[PDB]
C-alpha cells in the first residue's frame, strides 16, 4: 500500500532556498517515475516537475524552470526538490506523487511514455514571505444593544495559524472562528464571533482566548459590551 | 497548452453530473480525472479516458470526443462533494497539464439567507490610530456571497478583503470582510456601509462613527 511522506515545508524570505523531501514505500521506487505538484492554497493543481527511475528522463514547468531542482536517492526511496530563488508565487502547497509508469515501445518511433498520478502523499507547507514571526494584537469586538453577536479581531500576526477559543473552552456553542485574510502588510488577521443570549449580557461574561504558537504567544481578553 | 474547465458546478441528490474539459484536439490525448476533498490527497477516478480504477464505484464513467471530455457521475450523493481535475501530458511541451479544478456542490440542504452583522472599529484599535470594519456574514447556504462597501452613498474598493465562504459547525456557510480606515477616514463620514448579495437578494448594515 502506497506511502509518501513530505517534509521540510517552512517559511522564507523572497530571494531564498528550501529543500522539500519526500519518503516512500509501499511499492518499488527503483522503478517508478516520481512528480511534485503543488497547490496555492485555494486555488488548483499546479504541476512542477517529473522525474523518472534513473533520472534519465527530467522536466520541468515553465514557472520554475531554472530556479528549481528535481534529484532522487534510490537506495533511501527519497525524492528531493530544491527551490532556489524563491518568489511569493511559490507560496503553495507542495505535494509529491508517484506515477504508474505506463510505457510504450515501437522500433523505429522510439519509447512513448504517458504520464498520470497513481499516488500521493499528504503535502507539505511553503510559504515565501517578507514577513517574520510576530504575535498578534487582540481587539474586542463589542456587541451593540433575540440575541446578539460579540467577537475579537486577532490583527497584524505571521506565521499561521492561530486559534481562538471562548471561556478557556467551555463556550462552543454559537462559535464561529473565520479564515484568516492577508493583507498588503504581508501580516494576517481574523475575527472570531459568538452568538449568545441577548439578555445574558450584564450577568455571564465572555472572554476569548487567541493562541499562535509560532511567536509563542497566548492572548486573553474578555469583551464587554460598550458604554456610550 | 491549455485546459478549461467550468469553475462550478451542482445538482440535486441521486441526479446526474456533468463535469467537462476543454481543450484543443483534446480527443488525440489521454485525459484522466482527480478527485480532490478539502484538505486532502487527490485521487484517480477515470484514467485513459474512460477507464476506470478498482475501487471507485461504477457511477464513474469517462467520455473524450473532438474538443471535450467528460467525467460524468451518476446517482450523485452528500459524499461526491469535492474538487474534480482533468490532466493531459502535453508531448510537445513536455509539460503535465491540469485543468482549473470544478468544485461539485451537491444541494443537499435548504437554502438559507445570510444574516449579516457589522462591528466598528472598537475604541482601543483607534487609540492605535487603527480604524477598522468587520463584516461578519454567517448562516447562508448555498456557500457564494458578494460583498460592496459603501461610503455614506458612494462604493469604494480601496482597502477592503475579504474571505472565500467556508462551512460551519452546520454545514452552512460563513465569510467574513474587513474594510481598513485611517482614524480620520472614518469619523470626516456621516456612517458606512456593508451590502451582501446572496442568490438576487440583498441585504445591508450600517454604521455611523457617531454612536454605537
Known amino acids: 500500500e502506497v506511502q509518501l511522506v513530505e517534509s521540510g515545508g517552512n517559511v522564507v524570505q523572497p530571494g531564498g532556498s528550501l529543500r522539500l523531501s519526500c519518503t516512500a514505500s509501499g511499492f518499488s521506487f527503483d522503478d517508478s517515475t516520481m512528480h511534485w505538484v503543488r497547490q496555492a492554497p485555494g486555488k488548483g493543481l499546479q504541476w512542477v516537475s517529473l522525474i523518472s527511475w534513473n533520472g534519465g528522463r527530467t522536466y520541468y514547468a515553465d514557472s520554475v524552470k531554472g530556479r528549481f531542482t528535481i534529484s532522487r536517492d534510490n537506495s533511501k526511496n527519497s525524492l528531493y526538490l530544491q527551490m532556489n530563488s524563491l518568489k511569493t508565487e511559490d507560496t503553495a502547497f507542495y505535494f509529491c506523487?508517484?506515477?504508474?509508469?505506463?510505457?510504450?515501445?515501437?522500433?523505429?518511433?522510439?519509447?512513448?511514455?504517458?504520464?498520470?498520478?497513481?499516488?500521493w502523499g499528504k503535502g507539505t507547507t511553503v510559504t515565501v514571505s517578507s514577513a517574520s514571526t510576530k504575535g498578534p494584537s487582540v481587539f474586542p469586538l463589542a456587541p451593540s444593544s433575540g440575541t446578539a453577536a460579540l467577537g475579537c479581531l486577532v490583527k497584524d500576526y505571521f506565521p499561521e495559524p492561530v486559534t481562538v477559543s471562548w471561556n478557556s473552552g467551555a463556550l462552543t456553542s454559537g462559535v464561529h472562528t473565520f479564515p484568516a485574510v492577508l493583507q498588503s502588510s504581508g501580516l494576517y488577521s481574523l475575527s472570531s464571533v459568538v452568538t449568545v443570549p441577548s439578555s445574558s449580557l450584564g450577568t455571564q461574561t465572555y472572554i476569548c482566548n487567541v493562541n499562535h504558537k509560532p511567536s509563542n504567544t497566548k492572548v486573553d481578553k474578555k469583551v464587554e459590551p460598550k458604554s456610550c | 497548452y491549455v485546459l478549461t474547465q467550468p469553475p462550478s458546478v451542482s445538482v440535486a441528490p441521486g441526479k446526474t453530473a456533468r463535469i467537462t474539459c476543454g481543450g484543443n484536439?483534446?480527443?488525440?490525448?489521454?485525459v484522466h480525472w482527480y478527485q480532490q476533498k478539502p484538505g486532502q490527497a487527490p485521487v484517480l477516478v477515470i484514467y485513459?479516458?474512460?477507464d476506470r480504477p478498482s475501487g471507485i464505484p461504477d457511477r464513474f464513467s469517462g467520455s473524450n470526443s473532438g474538443n471535450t471530455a467528460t467525467l460524468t457521475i451518476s446517482r450523485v450523493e452528500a459524499g461526491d462533494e469535492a474538487d474534480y481535475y482533468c490532466q493531459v501530458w502535453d508531448s510537445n511541451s513536455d509539460h503535465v497539464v491540469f485543468g482549473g479544478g470544478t468544485q461539485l456542490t451537491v444541494l443537499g440542504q435548504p437554502k438559507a439567507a445570510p444574516s449579516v452583522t457589522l462591528f466598528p472599529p472598537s475604541s482601543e484599535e483607534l487609540q492605535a490610530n487603527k480604524a477598522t470594519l468587520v463584516c461578519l456574514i454567517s448562516d447562508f447556504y448555498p456557500g457564494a456571497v458578494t460583498v460592496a462597501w459603501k461610503a455614506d452613498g458612494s462604493p469604494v474598493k480601496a482597502g477592503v478583503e475579504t474571505t472565500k465562504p467556508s462551512k460551519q459547525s452546520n454545514n452552512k456557510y460563513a465569510a467574513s470582510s474587513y474594510l481598513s480606515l485611517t482614524p480620520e477616514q472614518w469619523k470626516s463620514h456621516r456612517s458606512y456601509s456593508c451590502q451582501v448579495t446572496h442568490e438576487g437578494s440583498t441585504v445591508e448594515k450600517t454604521v455611523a462613527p457617531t454612536e454605537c
Open positions: 485513459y479516458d474512460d
Open positions: 506523487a508517484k506515477d504508474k509508469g505506463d510505457s510504450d515501445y515501437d522500433y523505429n518511433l522510439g519509447y512513448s511514455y504517458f504520464y498520470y498520478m497513481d499516488g
Open positions: 484536439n483534446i480527443a488525440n490525448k489521454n
